[PDB]
Each structure stands twice: as structure tokens, then as C-alpha cells.
Design a protein around this ligand. Structure first.
Ligand SMILES: N[C@@H](Cc1ccccc1)C(=O)O
Length: 407
């Protein structure tokens, strides 16, 4: 089960090192490209978004052709994923505990924004990126190691932005003042208000297209290193406000660095599983990855506009088991255990909760106790088979994570 190094992926070879933390299970998902699978719910959202840009977005010059990139390799450099987007070298979004690193220099993209700089650099004014993205996180019905994002970028020239106004040729895109909560230092408020208006009006119309003139949305001010001002859009769903996308006015240093210093732009990044789970009332993110026809056939529509009225699957009983152990001497991350659960338990596991931790005074070691909910999306799980999965996770935690079984 070692080496250890190398890792081979899509023909290329990645020497392992101190950053390397890809699990075999996660790599078996690379290439699957659910966003490209005809009649998959993620493919369906992608197509409806594409049609909206092609038919229903208007510009004064008028409206850009959005070139669509849904087949980019997820293997990116840390420069693509982080530095091109002005993300600081000490930013927590870079933590080994949160990202799948092939090694020091390469990784599975954590967001589709990892392609913004390159596509700008190629001179494109308007583009969509659709792709599988990869993040190390907890286990519950809303988190999965792979999910899918749709990115959009839209640049404006000065005369395009101000095209509707009389003395517009004296209005400008850029100035030299201060950054506020409302604008970057090199942007005029004249420009920012028009870009922000275009961004939100375009997203509101896309949501009305996807959902119907019924839904309740709200804009929440937030922060990203690569846009300013920035927002999340939240949809109220089952009584709770849920974020589905981040967006904002692109940081001018990013746009200038790619070679488009005569442009101002907006960008957004939407979570396809998050929206699909809301649009269709899909209760667990693991359903996107199952091949059960009770789920999948419901999204075979005659055309991408035939409304699908998702009928929820039966829920099957769960088996609950706890697992406690002594942490190794200062070398452990919660997300390592979560990776190992994914590896051994796979899609049998509905969630894992760290329920207890304490330090033992005589020994100085830390104990963790995790509660593991076993529940299959397609069938009832036998006590017998869960017992065997659980015992294997216990032994595996001892061999690989260096834990000491406390149970
Ligand atoms: N990349 C961000 C979303 C985003 C895209 C573009 C602009 C602003 C925000 C994320 O994954 O959360």
C-alpha cells in the first residue's frame, strides 16, 4: 500500500511530497464529469443556464457571446487556483486540511475561478466555466468531496457601460481614490453602480428563469480576495436562507494582470449541487452519484425546458455506531478521518459528527469520539454489513492514521 509516490492521473505523473494528500477514492471520480452526462440533473441546470445567456441576456452593443468551457482538466497549479486570484499566501483557504494537493505545485481545483486568469489572458470578454471541483470537508447530506460549479465572467468597455447616456464620453471607468465598503480604489462609483446593477439584474432573471417568479432571494454583502464589492445570493428554502452563489465586481489588479486594463468586469460562481437540491428538492448530495434509475430517470425530459417534478425516494433506516480513539502525537486532522470514512464506508455513510473530545491528564493524549450514521440512499442496510464496514474502519484508522483504539 506504499509507495506512496508517484501519482499518475490522465497520462501525467505527479511526484508525491509533503503536501500530497490525494486519496485513491477521490481520484476514481476524476473524469466522471456529471455536468456533461446527458439527462443528469447537473447537466440539466448547465443547459438551462446556457440557454438563458444565449437567449435572454441583453447588452447595449448588444450582449456578449459567452463561450462555454465544460471540459477543462481539474488539475491546476496553486498559482492558477490561488495566486492569480490575489489570495494571500497565508490565507486559510490554502490549508492542506481543506484541499486535495497532488503535491506542492499541483492540485485538484477547489473552485472554477481557477480558470478566470487564463481565459481572460486569452482575451475573452465573456465566458462560462463548468466543472467538477474538489474540497476536503465534513460528511453530511450537503457536503461531498467532489461537487460542481458554474462560473461566469463578463467584461465591459467604457463606452459600452455608459452607452445609454448623453454626455457619457466624459464619464470614466477608472480613478485614484480610496477603497470603501462599496468600491475598489481605482474604480469610479459611476462604473461600479452600473456593473453591480447589471450583475444582480442578470442573476435575478436567471433565477426567475430557473425557478419561477415565486422565489424569495436576498443579497448578502461578503468578501472574496478577487472581487469587490462582493455578494452572496441566498434563496429561502424550507424556511432557511441558503447561499447558492458568490459574485462581485472583479478586482482590477486581476483583470489588469491578465491583459485587459481597458475593461471592468463582473464574475460569479454558482454551486450546481446546491441549486439543484433546492430546485428539485433533492435531499442528499450522494444521490447525484448513484446510478439508481428511481432517481436518474426522473431527469430524462423531452427537452431541457420540460419541468421535472422530482418525487422523493423512500428513506431507509439508519444504523448508528460510535468510534473513539487516542489521537497520534500531534499529526492529526479531522479531515483525514473523514477521507478514511469516505474510502472505507463510501456512500453508505450519511454523516459523521465529532461528538466528544478531551485531554487525558496522566498521558497528555487527546481522545476523539465520532458518531457515524450509516444509511444507504437505495436500500436498507443490514446490521451485519455495517458491523463489518465499521470494524474495518476501526482497524484502518489504527494502521494509517496512527490512532490508538479506545472504542
Ligand atoms: N470561487 C468562489 C465563488 C465566486 C466566483 C466568482 C466571483 C466571486 C465568488 C467560491 O467557490 O466560493
Amino acid at each position: 500500500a506504499a509507495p506512496g509516490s508517484v501519482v499518475e492521473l490522465l497520462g501525467k505523473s505527479y511526484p508525491q511530497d509533503d503536501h500530497s494528500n490525494l486519496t485513491r477514492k477521490v481520484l476514481t471520480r476524476v473524469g466522471r464529469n456529471l455536468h456533461n452526462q446527458q439527462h443528469h440533473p447537473l447537466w440539466l441546470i448547465k443547459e438551462r443556464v446556457k440557454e438563458h445567456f444565449y437567449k435572454q441576456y441583453v447588452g447595449r452593443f448588444g450582449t456578449p457571446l459567452f463561450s462555454v468551457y465544460d471540459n477543462l482538466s481539474p488539475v491546476v497549479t496553486t498559482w492558477q487556483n490561488f495566486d492569480s486570484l490575489l489570495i494571500p499566501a497565508d490565507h486559510p483557504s490554502r490549508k492542506k486540511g481543506d484541499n486535495y494537493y497532488l503535491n506542492r505545485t499541483h492540485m485538484l481545483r477547489a473552485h472554477t475561478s481557477a480558470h478566470q486568469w487564463d481565459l481572460l489572458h486569452a482575451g475573452l470578454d465573456a465566458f462560462l466555466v463548468v466543472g467538477d471541483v474538489y474540497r476536503r470537508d465534513q460528511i453530511d447530506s450537503q457536503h461531498y468531496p467532489i461537487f460542481h460549479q458554474l462560473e461566469a465572467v463578463r467584461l465591459f468597455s467604457k463606452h459600452e457601460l455608459f452607452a445609454g447616456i448623453k454626455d457619457g464620453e466624459s464619464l470614466q471607468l477608472f480613478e485614484q481614490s480610496s477603497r470603501s465598503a462599496h468600491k475598489q480604489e481605482t474604480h469610479t462609483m459611476e462604473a461600479v453602480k452600473l456593473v453591480e446593477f447589471d450583475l444582480k439584474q442578470m442573476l435575478t432573471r436567471l433565477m426567475a428563469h430557473l425557478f419561477g417568479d415565486e422565489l424569495e432571494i436576498r443579497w448578502v454583502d461578503c468578501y472574496f480576495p478577487f472581487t469587490h464589492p462582493s455578494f452572496e445570493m441566498e434563496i429561502n428554502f424550507h424556511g432557511e436562507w441558503l447561499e447558492v452563489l458568490g459574485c462581485g465586481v472583479m478586482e482590477q489588479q486581476l483583470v489588469n494582470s491578465a491583459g485587459a486594463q481597458d475593461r471592468i468586469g463582473w464574475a460569479f460562481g454558482l454551486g450546481l449541487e446546491r441549486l439543484a437540491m433546492i430546485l428539485y428538492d433533492i435531499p442528499d448530495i450522494r444521490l447525484f452519484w448513484c446510478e439508481d434509475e428511481r432517481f436518474l430517470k426522473q431527469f430524462c425530459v423531452s427537452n431541457i425546458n420540460q419541468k421535472v417534478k422530482f418525487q422523493p425516494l423512500s428513506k431507509y433506516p439508519a444504523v448508528i455506531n460510535d468510534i473513539s480513539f487516542w489521537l497520534p502525537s500531534e499529526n492529526y486532522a479531522e479531515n483525514d478521518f473523514y477521507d478514511l470514512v469516505r474510502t472505507i464506508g463510501g456512500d453508505l455513510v450519511e454523516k459523521v459528527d465529532l461528538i466528544d473530545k478531551f485531554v487525558h491528564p496522566k498521558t497528555h493524549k487527546t481522545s476523539h469520539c465520532y458518531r457515524i450514521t450509516y444509511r444507504h440512499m437505495e436500500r436498507t442496510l443490514s446490521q451485519r454489513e455495517v458491523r463489518h464496514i465499521h470494524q474495518a474502519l476501526q482497524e484502518a484508522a489504527v494502521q494509517l492514521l496512527g490512532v490508538e483504539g479506545r472504542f
